[PDB]
Write an enzyme that holds these catalytic residues in place. Structure first.
Site, PDB file in Angstrom:
ATOM      1  CD  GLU A  35      46.179  28.514  23.832  1.00  0.00           C
ATOM      2  OE1 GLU A  35      45.182  28.843  24.478  1.00  0.00           O
ATOM      3  OE2 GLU A  35      47.315  28.550  24.340  1.00  0.00           O
ATOM      4  CG  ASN A  46      41.623  33.344  31.875  1.00  0.00           C
ATOM      5  OD1 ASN A  46      41.669  34.089  30.897  1.00  0.00           O
ATOM      6  ND2 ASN A  46      41.900  32.049  31.803  1.00  0.00           N
ATOM      7  CG  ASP A  48      42.788  37.656  35.152  1.00  0.00           C
ATOM      8  OD1 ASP A  48      42.776  36.620  34.469  1.00  0.00           O
ATOM      9  OD2 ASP A  48      42.798  38.793  34.663  1.00  0.00           O
ATOM     10  CB  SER A  50      40.920  38.468  31.571  1.00  0.00           C
ATOM     11  OG  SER A  50      41.779  37.565  32.235  1.00  0.00           O
ATOM     12  CG  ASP A  52      41.954  33.371  27.688  1.00  0.00           C
ATOM     13  OD1 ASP A  52      42.636  34.423  27.813  1.00  0.00           O
ATOM     14  OD2 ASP A  52      41.944  32.462  28.544  1.00  0.00           O
ATOM     15  CG  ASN A  59      43.740  37.651  28.759  1.00  0.00           C
ATOM     16  OD1 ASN A  59      43.017  36.861  29.344  1.00  0.00           O
ATOM     17  ND2 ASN A  59      44.208  38.748  29.335  1.00  0.00           N
TER      18      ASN A  59
END
Length: 129
Positions: A35, A46, A48, A50, A52, A59
């Site tokens: 990750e 991301n 959308d 958002s 991380d 998120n």
């Protein structure tokens, strides 16, 4: 901060991730590896909108608040930036909430795709714990 494989395992064991909800330590270290690459300041945007954050890449839409993700909840009740510390206490507390939710660690794509059903014990191989 960038952790070592074993340094991190120990940190996670002291914070009670070792075998939490059935997920042995290897699993978390494996997820962490893929990750974030053991780096506490990893951020990723991301599509959308958002972002991380942290070792375990949590998120902003559901779990923390980055002040710029519309419609977000803050289910772990912390600012997302708190997840970028070297003290992994917040990340760990929030992961425990995520994992307890119902989908288990499938909530992490890297785990699902790179750690699931592999010799995850290899990750804690040769550490003093």
């Amino acid at each position: 901060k960038v952790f070592g494989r074993c340094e991190l395992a120990a940190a996670m064991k002291r914070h009670g991730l070792d075998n939490y909800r059935g997920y042995s330590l290897g699993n978390w270290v494996c997820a962490a590896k893929f990750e974030s690459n053991f780096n506490t300041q990893a951020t990723n945007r991301n599509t959308d909108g958002s972002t991380d954050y942290g070792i375990l890449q949590i998120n902003s839409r559901w779990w923390c608040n980055d002040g710029r993700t519309p419609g977000s909840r803050n289910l772990c009740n912390i600012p997302c930036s708190a997840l970028l510390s070297s003290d992994i206490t917040a990340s760990v507390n929030c992961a425990k909430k995520i994992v307890s939710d119902g989908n288990g660690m499938n909530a992490w794509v890297a785990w699902r795709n790179r750690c699931k059903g592999t010799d995850v014990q290899a990750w804690i191989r040769g550490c003093r714990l």
